[model samples]
Target: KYYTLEEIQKHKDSKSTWVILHHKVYDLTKFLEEHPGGEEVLREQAGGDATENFEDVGHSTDARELSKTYIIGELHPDDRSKIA
Candidate 1:
């Protein structure tokens, strides 16, 4: 499935958080409590981009593989450009 950044922006909250990571989108609403880093850091990036922070943390190969389970879509072309 595909989703626009504008659409993702609407979900910036604990109840419906969605975030972009490595150009892929994922709905984190359900994963909030499961996150190892805790909800505050992840929640703060809801409906926004988390690529940088996620990479900075040096997530392992397993973490990268695990993220695939939550990917919703790739960022739209326009959305990719604005951030690029």
Candidate 2:
């Protein structure tokens, strides 16, 4: 699946939450309460890119293993950026 940044941004709500990380879209709505980072932190980044924040936290391999459940689509072609 794939989604545009505009569409991804519109999901910014308490009920329907979404976020971007490393050019990928993730539906984190259900994980809001289960998030180890707290709802405030996750909601703070709702409907926005959190790549830097995610990396800065240095999540463990176990955390990354759970990514498959949340991922929904790839980044918008117009919004994709180079890391290096």
Candidate 3:
């Protein structure tokens, strides 16, 4: 169940926030309030790649493991080339 960039883009709003991390698409709508940094931090990277931001924060192993629960699917193969 892969998703295209355009599809992911539509989820930027609070109603449905989504983000890409390491090529995997994650729905953070539910996690918004649960985020330790607060919803604003996740909102800022919604509907786009957050791999760099996620890495920069140096999230702990437990945090990384927890993130896997939100994974919906990987980015569509066709859309991979569009990501940097």
Q: Tell me how many clashing residue pairs each candidate has.
A: 0, 0, 0
TM-score of decoy 2: 0.81
On lDDT, who's better, 1 or 2? 1
Model 3, position 2, has a per-residue lDDT of 96
The numbered model that scores best in TM-score is 3
Number of the top lDDT candidate: 3
lDDT tens digits, residues 1-84, model 2? 777767777887677788787777888887888987778877887778776676567788676667656778877676676321
Worst ten in a row by lDDT for model 3: 49-58
**Candidate 1 lDDT:** 0.80
Q: Rank the models by lDDT, top first.
A: 3, 1, 2
Residue 69's lDDT within candidate 1 is 86
As for model 3, its CA RMSD to the true structure in angstroms is 1.4
Residue-level lDDT tens digits of model 1 in 1-84 = 667878888888768888888889988887788888878888887777787777667788787788888787888777786544
- lDDT, model 2, position 75: 77
Q: Candidate 1: where are CA atoms >4 Å away?
A: none
> For candidate 3, lDDT tens digit of each residue in 1-84?
799888888898677899888788888887888877888878888888877787668888787787787778998888787767
Candidate 2 residue pairs in clash (backbone atoms < 3 Å): none
